[PDB]
């Protein structure tokens, strides 16, 4: 939808270049700045809509008030970002709790869904005043080719962007802390059953007490839940729960 609009404006500017009007780079440069400004606010809205979707604060259309008889055909400026579920199979092999996918892979998967969202705007084609001139001897880099710079053109400064990064870091950090608790049940392996038996010794009273404690600790994992969601990130701890 943006690229189609940027196609129409380019053809009109090409017609202005076609008829040899004066001062066309100045007028095009002013229009190019104006377009970048609009792409700035839409990109700022897109990040905040994406941040709301990431944190679970995105408002579903069910909560859009139906008393407002005016049609809201204008879609959200930030769009409707959809972070898909990213389950992590917690696992313990030979008494060694390890997580594959790790919380670090949650960092990868989360930052990766985000990197797609920024590319909705950052990968758009940049309007060129002299596009109509073909083979023009002008250097063109990626920032010249695309609005790869719109992320500095956000209206509230860099706050919208830094909130998106903070949101991703916050969710990944929460997942990492949660996974770290399971990754710590490797305590069966780290010092062996024999070490506990050295601790109990020949005292049958301590063995009776331990058997009661192990049964109490088993009761904590007799839950049917296999997946816990913290915003859009799911930990499939059911594999460890098995």
């Amino acid at each position: 939808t943006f690229s189609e609009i940027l196609n129409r404006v380019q053809k009109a500017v090409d017609d202005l270049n076609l008829h040899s009007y004066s001062n066309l780079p100045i007028w095009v440069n002013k229009l190019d700045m104006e377009i970048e400004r609009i792409l700035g606010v839409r990109l700022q809205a897109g990040l905040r809509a994406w941040t709301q979707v990431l944190l679970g604060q995105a408002e579903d259309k069910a909560e859009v008030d139906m008393d407002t008889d005016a049609p809201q055909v204008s879609h959200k400026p930030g769009g409707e970002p959809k972070i898909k579920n990213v389950v992590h199979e917690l696992r313990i092999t030979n008494q060694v709790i390890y997580l594959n996918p790790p919380i670090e892979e949650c960092r990868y998967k989360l930052y990766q869904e985000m990197f797609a969202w920024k590319m909705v705007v950052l990968s758009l084609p940049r309007i060129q005043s002299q596009r109509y001139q073909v083979g023009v001897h002008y250097e063109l880099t990626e920032e010249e080719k695309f609005y790869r710079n719109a992320l500095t053109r956000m209206p509230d400064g860099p706050v919208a962007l830094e909130e998106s990064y903070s949101a991703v870091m916050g969710i990944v950090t929460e997942v990492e802390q949660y996974v770290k608790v399971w990754l710590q049940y490797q305590c069966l392996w780290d010092m062996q059953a024999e070490n506990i038996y050295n601790r109990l010794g020949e005292d049958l009273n301590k063995w009776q007490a331990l058997l009661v404690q192990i049964r109490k600790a088993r009761g904590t994992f007799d839950n049917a839940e296999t997946k816990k969601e913290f915003g859009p990130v799911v930990i499939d701890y059911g594999k460890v729960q098995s």
Binding site: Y108, Y111, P158, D190, N195
Partner: protein
């Protein structure tokens, strides 16, 4: 429990994932491309601000895997505050700093490097580390320094653009000048220099080995190369002013004390110099002009 906790304190642990690499450089210097390539990925989506990624490190001998955190900052200082999100007090010793030097635009190399080095200096100033901890870190770093026998890491990107410099700007072996300056800068900050070319796939494996060495403490054996013009590699502690003096012999018009800007010039790129804003004279001003014309007649 107490039992489980005690077992845990005996875990054969993975190599540290927490380790961090921080990458600095001007926009377009090849930071993202370089790191993506090291990751083994074909396409890195270009981010503005603080870019992210991680290296998967595999030890074939132990059949073990670990992963290094990757964080590359945007060229603009408008995104500088993201550094607090890349490095923290606890993670600072685990962090390895990578600074990118653009050889396609050599004239902005040193200036951008001081820009990046300075920004790191104010960042650590904001961090508020205890002076005892700061002295301990400096002791560890200098201990690593003198104990080198045959951290900040300077990586030169798009060195193959030297071939363009020979043609487009009539550069020669003397313009030794830039690499001597860069080595002196490394000595000033005690960094390790390496030359790279993703286009030619030069020293990529050497770079990867050196990163794994410095972060995870792995072994390293490659020697220092300072003869090849676009493949110079200098690990930490190798460089010295006496060792740097070999390049000063090759000079024949310049001197080591000569300024960088004078000898190597920033070209005046022929941008479309926009014309003066021509505006129609207002009715009042044009008619005051006509009044002046009529009155004198």
């Amino acid at each position: 429990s107490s039992i489980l906790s005690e077992v845990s304190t005996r875990a054969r642990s993975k190599l540290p994932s927490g380790k961090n690499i921080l990458v600095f450089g001007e926009d377009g210097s090849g930071k993202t491309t370089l790191m993506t390539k090291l990751q083994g990925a074909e396409h890195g989506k270009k981010g503005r601000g603080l870019e992210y990624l991680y290296l998967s490190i595999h030890d074939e001998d132990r059949d073990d895997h670990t992963r290094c955190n990757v964080w590359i900052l945007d060229g603009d200082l408008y995104h500088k505050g993201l550094l607090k999100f890349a490095v923290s007090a606890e993670s600072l010793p685990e962090t390895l700093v990578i600074f990118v030097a653009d050889m396609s635009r050599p004239w902005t190399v040193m200036e951008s490097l001081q820009k990046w080095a300075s920004v790191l200096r104010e960042h650590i100033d904001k961090m508020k580390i205890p002076p005892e901890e700061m002295r301990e870190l400096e002791r560890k770093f200098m201990k690593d320094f003198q104990d080198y026998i045959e951290p900040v890491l300077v990586v030169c990107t798009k060195c193959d653009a030297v071939s363009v410099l020979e043609k487009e700007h009539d550069y020669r072996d003397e313009h030794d000048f830039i690499q001597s300056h860069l080595r002196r800068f490394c000595l000033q900050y005690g960094a390790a220099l390496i030359y790279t070319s993703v286009k030619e796939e030069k020293n990529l494996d050497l770079l990867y080995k050196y990163i794994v060495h410095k972060t995870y403490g792995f072994h390293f054996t490659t020697p220092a190369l300072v003869v090849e013009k676009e493949a110079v590699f200098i690990p930490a502690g190798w460089d010295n002013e006496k060792k740097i003096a070999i390049l000063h012999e090759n000079f024949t018009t310049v001197k080591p004390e000569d300024a960088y800007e004078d000898f190597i010039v920033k070209p005046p790129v022929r941008k479309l110099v926009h014309d003066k804003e021509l505006a129609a004279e207002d009715e009042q001003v044009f008619l005051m002009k006509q009044q002046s014309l009529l009155a004198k007649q």
